[PDB]
């Protein structure tokens, strides 16, 4: 029926599935219960403070559910048996997994992806190593425990009358073996129990995601009112595609799913092309091929000009090789798990991939193209192993006069000189010796957001509390002065006594990529010569053509949405004459290891800074500091850490050589491995088949030296693309001379590790096309690198660019974003700001093809217990919250559980709820929006459960600063004396000047206070503040709960500075006049009907985005400055320009900005922009509360200049900040008006002529502009024009 009603009826059944009996009503805002704990009792039992027998008496009575503490009922969770003990089930999926159970006596000790190893009682120390490996591999931390995830699927599957196979095999596992792992609810990383395989958490994540993806697509087929998915002529159900794939990826999930990824993505990307009638979506834009100003048209079906080209030697070899990548993968699964199933559904599809058409104008074909790209996320995040392998530089390609390796170097070298000239023409050069120490922290901090590095440090703090290294960007406020000295620069890292350490972090699907953590003695000499390349290429505006000679437009590095950022793929795939060649390099970074790149790059930057020869940094010339950053032996010999290469022997070989040749202390030995002193005696006696022990070397293989272009460098993303442009422009040369007149090149563009051209293929002949395609692959092989024919595509109607797929002028989307796991253990210290991001995540998910009704239910599942279990205190039955005292009857079975109401996702923000709307996800609900949504007469059936629970929401968590555990005198001020702007440094030379400037409205930013706010800003991180003030907030959260009232009120306006979007309730809003009746066109199909009807009746964004408020206009222009934007905001600069009164001259405005530690090059535009907007400026700000920060809203036409003229009609006597709150109310109301099916009318602000209700508007506008609390402090000037204009206009 409704969404809020049947959503809450299922969530109430989940908690009565997660707990045996709990009287959870809807009308209550929260339910409070207690849980039993025994470990913290047993510590008290060791000290001997007892009254009553705790263990047996409490546990028996909890199972009989009679007893309760302080009136609040106390109970435990349901066991792992009873989650799926309501029904029994047997399945072949569980019989495959128990056949894939491998004993201890088969394992390889350093596989990159784990197999299914059996747990055994009285386990040996090598099975303890697998227990060490399993605890470090399959960490499934996240939002919600995996047990109550399974109660959600079990509850949902009974309602939709469909049984997913992920639920089937889990129910087949539960009744045989009871509980695979005991996971905690307070933290989500702890788990210690392990039944028949270690891979049971990675199994249960793979089983839940197979259940969610089936509940997605069966619900989506109901939404488009179809019973099957069509592929050309035939029909296949997509549940059969998942079930054959889940069986295949079962016996080794993290290796089989990784290798099936390339034939799956290639199959969709070659589906529609080659068919004889081809339907496209017509679109036209600028004459450049990289034009983003695309508007769209109707559909049409053209004949195919390339209908005969696909019977060539290229396309027949590419499909044959992609079949072998499947056939090598499935035959690997035949041997491991003893099953004889050969994946017959998908292989029938791919046999005729170039022939059968794909038409986007049907819903059935668009769903299947997006379904096969979403099937890759079935195994969760990829936690892997990498062995530390050296360069093995005895096998890389020598510079021969046969191949073109030396021409890569001279063309890489030239492109660096061109980039430094084009940045010099755009006033970006390297930083001078005057400004070295003042730009050092600027570039080290904002490239730490780009590529973060490491240097060990002792971070000390006093009021006696010691903090560890805490690897962040504030390290250079401690040792910023001595990193650039004589002895710190002259050390090389090939010796054993000093080295650098690799760091590992996982990705959503791929292998786990390691990040190099380079020292500061090699980064800050590398950082100074990289600077004009970083800021210049972030200017995204450029024109791409090979006959144009400007490097700034071709290479792109890295407005929010990906539909408006990749509209070139939607235009060029619609053209019948564009034949894109997009290559990719398998094993790219290992072929940057050759001297073709690094020696070519190094002599480029030497000759480029040769005009800067005379200037010196503390006596160091540019040639000396270019060697301190790169080094002829620094990166040529850098010892890097990682896990050490470990062998496996027998214990008889160990006992006779133990005390003779085994040491400890140099490098750390893993948990279940035995050590050995050297590596020469390790590999000598190494071979065994029983492998009764495992050895690992500590000082023989000291570390692993590599000469590889590191990802930890500052020049990583730039120099990967200059070499990519150099290999690209030789491919332009050789193809033009080998086959002249064929395959002209209209545009090119280069990102790191990919290459894309938009070419006009001239001749349609198979005998001459393979002469072209073989000349491409031989040119890239002569350039040292290696290209793969099974991944490189040359096809007319299919364009892909950086994980953005487009086919025939339409959008084939993918959602590989995970919902369960993450790359770090998620702390929920700000719960209200957490699920606000989780709503905006699922908006991007539903815009990429997810179901609306299912993604609504996941967010109602989260909002009950995102922040439940983090309690340590006990409450009274008389509505009182206290800290519990350590007594005998208060320490046993006492942890509070707070289950929130599932309708807290619709109570608006500021009323302790989250602002999602039940009609659409991309609409947020503010305080005034709840008043208008209950006012519309057709929301009463939907918003009936939200109306009865609006104010009953208990408040959430927050982390604030404290006067305790705050200031330390000397940690930052050591480097803060050596670092200030020259405007700031002159103020610190005379104490009379520092007294004249604190009288200015700098206030909290005076030159005696700028140091102290800079240190309190650095200490917002985890290990110093959040781990220390965790004791503080629990004593402050109890105060906020007892002081919380259940009366709520919508307030017009806000505090005396800012206004909200609730300013629009000052006037009446009517709806007059029909606009039109034309449904718009858009390239993105596969949208839910709550999202389709907004994109239908309101078109996409064809114009540029509006510059709406003053506050967002500052943050665009404060973005050019670097340090302060991470610390100071647009709020504090706007109060300085408010407290200054009327702005009197431009030169007075620039000198107060540079006194606020702002860069001189950016402060001159601030004073030019603000003194042009002086006559329209008013003393007001704006709190948007994020009504357009999502991806789907920025893809729409709304909140632009042309939107306001054709929908809004406001009176002329409104100041610009008041206009912005009106138009931001307008874009939300016209979105809700379209999502309901209501006719689109032009809304107009309505004010009558009687003075009895005109005076109340006149009193309120004087109250908002000139508040009473701001005039008593002497802040409002009477000489402002918009303050004088308000009194005369409205009466």
């Amino acid at each position: 029926v409704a969404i809020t009603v049947q959503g809450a009826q299922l969530i109430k059944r989940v908690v009565e599935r997660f707990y045996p009996g709990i009287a959870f009503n809807i009308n209550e805002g929260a339910c409070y219960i207690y849980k039993f704990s025994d470990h913290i009792r047993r510590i008290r039992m060791k000290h001997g403070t007892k009254y009553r027998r705790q263990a047996e008496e409490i546990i028996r009575n909890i199972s009989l559910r009679k007893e309760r503490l302080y009136g609040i009922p106390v109970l435990d969770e349901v066991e792992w048996k009873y989650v799926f003990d309501g029904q029994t089930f047997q399945s072949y999926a569980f019989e495959v997994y128990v056949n894939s159970i491998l004993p201890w006596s088969e394992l390889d000790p350093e596989e990159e992806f784990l197999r299914n190893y059996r747990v055994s009682r009285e386990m040996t120390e090598v099975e303890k190593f697998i227990e060490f490996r399993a605890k470090n591999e399959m960490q499934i931390y996240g939002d919600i425990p995996i047990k109550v995830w399974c109660c959600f699927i079990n509850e949902l599957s009974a309602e939709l009358k469909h049984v997913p196979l992920g639920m089937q095999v889990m129910a087949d596992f539960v009744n045989r073996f009871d509980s695979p792992f005991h996971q905690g609810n307070r933290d989500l990383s702890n788990l210690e129990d392990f039944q028949v395989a270690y891979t049971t958490p990675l199994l249960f994540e793979m089983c839940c995601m197979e259940s969610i993806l089936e509940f997605n697509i069966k619900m989506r087929m109901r939404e488009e009112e179809i019973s099957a998915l069509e592929f050309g002529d035939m029909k296949v159900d997509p549940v059969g595609l998942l079930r054959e794939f889940f069986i295949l990826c079962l016996p080794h999930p993290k290796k089989i799913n990784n290798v099936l990824r390339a034939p799956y993505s290639w199959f969709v990307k070659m589906w529609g092309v080659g068919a004889d009638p081809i339907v496209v979506l017509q679109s036209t834009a600028g004459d450049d091929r990289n034009s983003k100003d695309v508007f769209y048209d109707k559909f049409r079906t053209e004949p195919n000009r390339y209908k005969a080209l696909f019977r060539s030697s290229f396309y027949n070899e590419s499909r044959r090789m992609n079949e072998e990548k499947i056939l090598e993968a499935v035959k690997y699964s035949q041997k491991l798990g003893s099953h004889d199933r050969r994946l017959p559904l998908f292989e029938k599809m791919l046999k005729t991939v170039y022939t059968t058409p794909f038409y986007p104008h049907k819903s059935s074909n668009m769903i299947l193209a997006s379904f096969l790209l979403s099937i890759q996320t079935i195994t969760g995040y990829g936690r892997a192993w990498v062995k530390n392998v050296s360069t093995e530089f005895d096998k890389q390609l020598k510079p021969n006069p046969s191949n073109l390796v030396q021409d890569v170097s001279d063309l890489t070298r030239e492109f660096f000189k061109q980039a430094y000239v084009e940045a010099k023409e755009r006033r970006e050069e390297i930083v001078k010796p005057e400004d070295l120490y003042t730009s050092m922290l600027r570039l080290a901090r904002n490239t730490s957001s780009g590529f973060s590095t490491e240097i060990y440090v002792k971070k000390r703090f006093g009021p006696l509390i010691k903090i560890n290294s805490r690897i962040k960007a504030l390290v250079i406020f401690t040792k910023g002065h001595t990193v650039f000295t004589d002895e710190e620069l002259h050390k090389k890292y090939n010796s054993v006594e000093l080295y650098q350490t690799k760091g590992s972090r996982d990705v959503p699907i791929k292998a786990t990529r390691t990040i190099y953590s380079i020292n500061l003695s090699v980064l800050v000499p590398q950082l100074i010569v990289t600077l004009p390349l970083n800021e210049y290429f972030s200017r995204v505006g450029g024109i791409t053509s090979p006959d144009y000679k400007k490097i700034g437009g071709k290479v792109i590095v890295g407005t929010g949405s990906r539909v408006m950022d990749a509209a070139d793929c939607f235009r060029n795939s619609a053209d019948r004459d564009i034949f894109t060649i997009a290559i990719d390099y398998s094993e790219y970074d290992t072929h940057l290891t050759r001297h073709n790149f690094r020696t070519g790059m190094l002599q480029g930057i030497r000759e480029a800074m040769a005009p800067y020869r005379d200037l010196r940094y503390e006596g160091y010339t540019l040639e000396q500091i270019i060697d301190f950053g790169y080094g002829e032996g620094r990166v040529a010999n850098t010892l890097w850490n990682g896990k050490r290469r470990l062998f496996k022997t027998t214990f008889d070989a160990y006992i006779r050589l133990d005390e003779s040749e085994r040491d400890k202390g140099s490098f750390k030995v893993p948990k279940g491995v035995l050590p050995v002193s050297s590596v020469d005696v390790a590999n000598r006696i190494a071979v065994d088949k029983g492998f009764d022990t495992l050895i690992a070397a500590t000082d023989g293989s000291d570390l692993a030296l590599i000469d590889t272009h590191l990802s930890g460098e500052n020049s990583t993303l730039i120099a990967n693309s200059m070499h990519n442009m150099a290999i690209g422009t030789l491919m332009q040369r050789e193809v033009g001379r080998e086959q002249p007149g064929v395959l002209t090149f209209l545009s090119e563009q280069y990102v790191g590790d990919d290459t894309l051209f938009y070419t006009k293929l001239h001749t349609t002949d198979t005998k001459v096309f393979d002469k072209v395609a073989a000349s491409i692959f031989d040119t890239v092989a002569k350039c040292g690198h290696e290209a793969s024919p099974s991944k490189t595509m040359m096809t007319p109607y299919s364009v892909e660019k950086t994980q953005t797929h487009a086919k025939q002028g339409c959008y084939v989307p993918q959602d590989r974003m995970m919902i369960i796991s993450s790359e770090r253990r998620k702390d929920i210290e700000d719960v209200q700001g957490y699920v606000r991001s989780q709503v905006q995540t699922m908006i991007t998910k539903v815009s990429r093809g997810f179901c609306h009704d299912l993604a609504q239910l996941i967010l109602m599942l989260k909002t009950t217990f995102i922040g439940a279990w983090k309690m340590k205190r006990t409450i009274k039955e008389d509505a009182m919250y206290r800290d519990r005292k350590f007594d005998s009857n208060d320490e046993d079975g006492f942890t509070l559980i707070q289950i929130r109401n599932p309708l807290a996702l619709y109570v608006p923000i500021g009323w302790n709820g989250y602002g999602a709307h039940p009609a659409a996800l991309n609409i947020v609900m503010t305080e005034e929006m709840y008043v208008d949504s209950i006012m519309i007469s057709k929301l009463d059936e939907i918003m009936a459960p939200i109306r009865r629970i609006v104010h009953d929401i208990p408040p959430c968590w927050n982390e604030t600063q404290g006067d305790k555990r705050g200031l330390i005198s000397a940690t930052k001020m050591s480097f803060f004396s050596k670092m200030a702007r020259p405007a700031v440094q002159a103020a610190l030379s005379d104490p009379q000047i520092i007294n004249l400037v604190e009288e200015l409205p700098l206030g909290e930013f005076s030159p005696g206070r700028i140091s102290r706010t800079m240190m309190h800003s650095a200490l917002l991180k985890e290990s110093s503040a959040r781990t220390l003030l965790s004791s503080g907030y629990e004593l402050e959260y109890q105060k906020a709960l007892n002081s919380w009232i259940t009366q709520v009120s919508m307030r017009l306006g806000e505090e005396s500075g800012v206004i909200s979007t609730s300013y629009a309730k000052l006037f009446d809003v009517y709806f007059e006049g029909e606009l039109d009746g034309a449904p718009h066109m858009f390239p993105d199909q596969n949208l839910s009907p709550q999202f389709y009807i907004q994109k239908m009746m309101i078109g996409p964004r064809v114009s540029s985005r509006v510059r709406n408020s003053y506050v967002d206009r500052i943050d665009v222009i404060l973005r050019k400055d670097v340090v302060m934007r991470g610390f100071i905001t647009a709020n504090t600069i706007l109060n300085v320009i408010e407290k200054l009164g009327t702005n009197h001259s431009v030169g007075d405005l620039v000198t107060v900005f540079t006194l606020m530690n702002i860069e001189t090059r950016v402060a001159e535009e601030l004073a030019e922009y603000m003194t042009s907007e002086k006559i329209r400026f008013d003393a007001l700000k704006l709190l948007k509360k994020g009504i357009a920060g999502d991806e789907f809203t920025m893809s729409l036409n709304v909140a632009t200049q042309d939107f306001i003229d054709t929908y809004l009609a406001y009176p002329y006597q409104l100041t610009k900040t008041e206009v912005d709150a009106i138009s931001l109310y307008c874009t939300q109301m016209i979105m809700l008006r379209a999502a309901l099916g209501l006719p689109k009318k032009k809304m107009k602000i309505v004010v009558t002529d009687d003075a009895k209700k005109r005076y109340k508007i006149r009193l309120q506008r004087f109250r908002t502009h000139v508040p009473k609390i701001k005039v008593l402090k002497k802040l409002i000037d009477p000489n402002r024009m918009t303050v004088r204009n308000l009194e005369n206009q409205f009466v």
């Binding site: 008043v931 209950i934 006012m935 104010h951 009366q1047 307030r1051 017009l1052």
Partner: peptide
Amino acid sequence: PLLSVFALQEIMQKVRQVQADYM
């Protein structure tokens, strides 16, 4: 100070009668 709208709206029979009399 400012003004505030209340929480309880039993006027939701009257205000729907007010706006329907306008239309």
